[PDB]
């Protein structure tokens, strides 16, 4: 009887399906920084605020990095393979992951720009950190972003929507919809899309990007 009961446990159907009344529309996340809320404060780190000067942006860029690294956390941004849609022979993704505001990465090619993040081993991402500069890079500012998820390039699937209006700072996105029990994302394949820029732009930069995961002597 042990075989029969475990089979029910692996695949509960009558217990699981409540009404099967899903709305099936894609949920959209609001990123605006003019409204103060507890949920927004959790995802927006730098704080709600004329347009600051670029050096002020560089200063807040470092303070955002320090605050994100201040908490107990493990950075594995360099523990994965990256393959953007196309280069421009001026700046590879290294200057995007160099944690420097002055340097940045630029793609050049088709309008739906793609950024690939491949992982070697099953890593459980909890917080994804991305930095935007609306006033500094208004021409190449990312306006709409769609984040995918999957275990392979084969099974990439939609996760979340992100609309950009005015965000001149680091953006933190912890994942809770997928798994409420773990409060983290478990995947080996993450890809990002930038289908259109602000004011009908063509290309897109990426100032910063980071990935966050949880975990006498003789010299």
């Amino acid at each position: 009887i042990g075989i029969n009961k475990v089979l029910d446990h692996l695949a509960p159907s009558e217990l699981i399906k409540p009404v099967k009344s899903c709305h099936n529309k894609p949920s959209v996340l609001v990123l605006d920084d003019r409204i103060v809320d507890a949920a927004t404060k959790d995802l927006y780190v730098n704080g709600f605020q004329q347009n600051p000067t670029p050096e002020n942006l560089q200063h807040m860029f470092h303070q955002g990095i320090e605050i994100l690294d201040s908490a107990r956390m493990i950075n594995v941004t360099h523990l994965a393979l990256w393959k953007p849609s196309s280069f421009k022979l001026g700046n590879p993704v290294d200057f995007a992951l160099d944690d420097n505001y002055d340097t940045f990465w630029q793609s050049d090619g088709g309008q739906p720009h793609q950024l690939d993040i491949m992982f070697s081993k099953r890593m459980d991402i909890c917080v994804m950190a991305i930095f935007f500069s609306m006033i500094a890079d208004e021409s190449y500012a990312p306006s709409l972003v769609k984040v995918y998820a999957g275990h392979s390039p084969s099974d990439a699937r939609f996760y979340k929507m992100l609309e950009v209006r005015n965000v001149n700072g680091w953006v933190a996105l912890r994942f809770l919809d997928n798994r409420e029990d773990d409060q983290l994302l478990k995947c080996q394949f993450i890809r990002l899309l930038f289908p259109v820029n602000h004011e009908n732009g063509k290309d897109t930069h990426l100032r910063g990007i980071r990935l966050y995961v949880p975990s006498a002597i003789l010299r």
Binding site: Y140, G201, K202
Partner: peptide, 6 residues
């Protein structure tokens, strides 16, 4: 400025 719109 580039990024010329149609």
């Amino acid at each position: 400025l580039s990024d010329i719109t149609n």
